Amino acid sequence: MLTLIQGKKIVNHLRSRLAFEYNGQLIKILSKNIVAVGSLRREEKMLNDVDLLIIVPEKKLLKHVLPNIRIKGLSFSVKVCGERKCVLFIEWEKKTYQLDLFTALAEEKPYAIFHFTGPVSYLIRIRAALKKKNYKLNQYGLFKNQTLVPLKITTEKELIKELGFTYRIPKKRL
């Protein structure tokens, strides 16, 4: 039970004050490699759960990105799940919040948000729509002219261009 600005400040501070220890080293994550997905993309009056997009710069680091996870002052739990699936919750003074994080690589940043917003429905119509155009998009890469090619773009809009479809807003989940 919180407003739009609430989750924004929550994630804004979260992604800012998030850091995990790996092999003795300290890996502090910031907005540079973290993009708020879900309710943050929808931007509604009140939200319950919030999603985030973490783009790891290496599959190895990906598997070792939640070793000694820690927050400056707030608390939280990190759960790992195959296929960019990351489930974590934050706790502040006996409180609890559901945070859904996606674990992608530095290159899956765009497709990451595309899959998160969804639902898959838009991806199903987009996949079939693209399928007619001989195009396909996968978490690993898109296929064009019967050739596997990765998604090399800047943002979602650019990503849509990567597929050759029309760009749409996230809040309009389909």
From Swiss-Prot:
Gene3D superfamilies: Beta Polymerase, domain 2, DNA polymerase, thumb domain. Disulfide bonds join C81-C86. The record marks H115 as: Stabilizes dGTP in a syn conformation to overcome the Watson-Crick base pairing constraint. Residues 42-51 are annotated as: Involved in ssDNA binding. Keywords: Disulfide bond, DNA damage, DNA repair, DNA-binding, DNA-directed DNA polymerase, Magnesium, Metal-binding, Nucleotidyltransferase, Transferase, Virion. It catalyses: DNA(n) + a 2'-deoxyribonucleoside 5'-triphosphate = DNA(n+1) + diphosphate. GO terms for cellular component: virion component. Changing H115E: 36x decreased dG:dGTP misincorporation. It is found in: Virion. In the presence of magnesium, pol X shows a strong preference for the ssDNA gaps having one and two nucleotides. Pfam families: DNA_pol_B_thumb (PF14791), NTP_transf_2 (PF01909). Its cofactor is Mg(2+). Changing R168A: Loss of DNA binding affinity. Decreased dGTP misincorporation. Its EC number is 2.7.7.7. It is an enzyme of class 2 (transferase). GO terms for biological process: double-strand break repair via nonhomologous end joining. Changing R125A: Loss of DNA binding affinity. Decreased dG:dGTP misincorporation. Mg(2+) binds at D49, D51, D100. Consistent with its intracellular location, ASFV encodes its own replicative DNA polymerase and three base excision repair enzymes: a class II AP endonuclease, the repair polymerase Pol X, and an ATP-dependent DNA ligase. PANTHER family: DNA POLYMERASE LAMBDA, DNA POLYMERASE TYPE-X FAMILY MEMBER. This is Repair DNA polymerase X. The lineage of its organism: Viruses, Varidnaviria, Bamfordvirae, Nucleocytoviricota, Pokkesviricetes.
